[PDB]
Design an enzyme around this catalytic site. Structure first.
Site, mmCIF file in Angstrom:
data_model
loop_
_atom_site.group_PDB
_atom_site.id
_atom_site.type_symbol
_atom_site.label_atom_id
_atom_site.label_comp_id
_atom_site.label_asym_id
_atom_site.label_seq_id
_atom_site.Cartn_x
_atom_site.Cartn_y
_atom_site.Cartn_z
ATOM 1 N N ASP A 168 2.568 -3.476 -1.131
ATOM 2 C CA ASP A 168 2.556 -3.511 -2.696
ATOM 3 C C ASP A 168 4.218 -3.970 -2.931
ATOM 4 O O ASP A 168 4.429 -3.934 -3.952
ATOM 5 C CB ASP A 168 2.379 -2.246 -3.199
ATOM 6 N N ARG A 174 7.743 -4.808 -6.870
ATOM 7 C CA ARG A 174 6.760 -3.945 -7.035
ATOM 8 C C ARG A 174 5.567 -4.768 -7.531
ATOM 9 O O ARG A 174 5.854 -5.390 -8.526
ATOM 10 C CB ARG A 174 7.073 -2.500 -7.873
ATOM 11 N N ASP A 182 -2.785 -1.305 -6.768
ATOM 12 C CA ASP A 182 -2.364 -0.187 -5.907
ATOM 13 C C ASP A 182 -3.090 -0.377 -4.629
ATOM 14 O O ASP A 182 -4.097 -0.579 -4.427
ATOM 15 C CB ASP A 182 -3.089 1.144 -6.498
ATOM 16 N N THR A 183 -2.248 -0.357 -3.648
ATOM 17 C CA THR A 183 -2.503 -0.701 -2.309
ATOM 18 C C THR A 183 -2.363 0.674 -1.207
ATOM 19 O O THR A 183 -1.502 1.411 -1.752
ATOM 20 C CB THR A 183 -1.676 -1.810 -1.647
ATOM 21 N N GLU A 187 -0.811 2.681 1.233
ATOM 22 C CA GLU A 187 0.463 2.676 1.754
ATOM 23 C C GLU A 187 0.586 3.023 3.118
ATOM 24 O O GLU A 187 -0.013 3.849 3.592
ATOM 25 C CB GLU A 187 1.362 3.510 0.736
#
Length: 136
Positions: free
Chosen positions: A16, A30, A35-36, A38
């Site tokens: 991200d 960003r 939402d990836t 992490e």
């Protein structure tokens, strides 16, 4: 209307986040609306599919001939000083690509930075339908 502006890749940080040279200034961007999992999660560190999302973003930006950033209509940086934008690699939006591959979910959207929300929700519905990665 939103517009694309050129940028130069410095380094991919996570699925991200990518560091780019924007208008002669090194900046951390960003990716908006996604939402990836992490690899650098403050509390968890490396999450399931984190390495995958990270490699996908890295591959996409590193192999691109042209990288462009597209800011939304709201604030352009978050509280950590990161630019908030839609990143394009040779005309393809990285944000959408991640969602389409089931390597990211559409985040909690904050109006007015929500222009491509429906577009991303559509790609997420498809990835889920196909049971890809995160959705397998």
């Amino acid at each position: 209307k939103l517009h694309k502006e050129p940028a130069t890749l410095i380094k991919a940080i996570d699925g991200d986040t990518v560091k780019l040279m924007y208008k002669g200034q090194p900046m951390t961007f960003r990716l908006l609306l996604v939402d990836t999992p992490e690899t650098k999660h403050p509390k968890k560190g490396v999450e399931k599919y984190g390495p995958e999302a990270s490699a996908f973003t890295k591959k996409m930006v590193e192999n691109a001939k042209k990288i462009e950033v597209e800011f939304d209509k709201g604030q352009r940086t978050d509280k950590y000083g990161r630019g908030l934008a839609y990143i394009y690699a040779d005309g393809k939006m990285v944000n959408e690509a991640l969602v389409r591959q089931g390597l990211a979910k559409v985040a909690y959207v904050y109006e007015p930075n929500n222009t491509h929300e429906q577009h991303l929700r559509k790609s997420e519905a498809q990835a889920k339908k196909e049971k890809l990665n995160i959705w397998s």
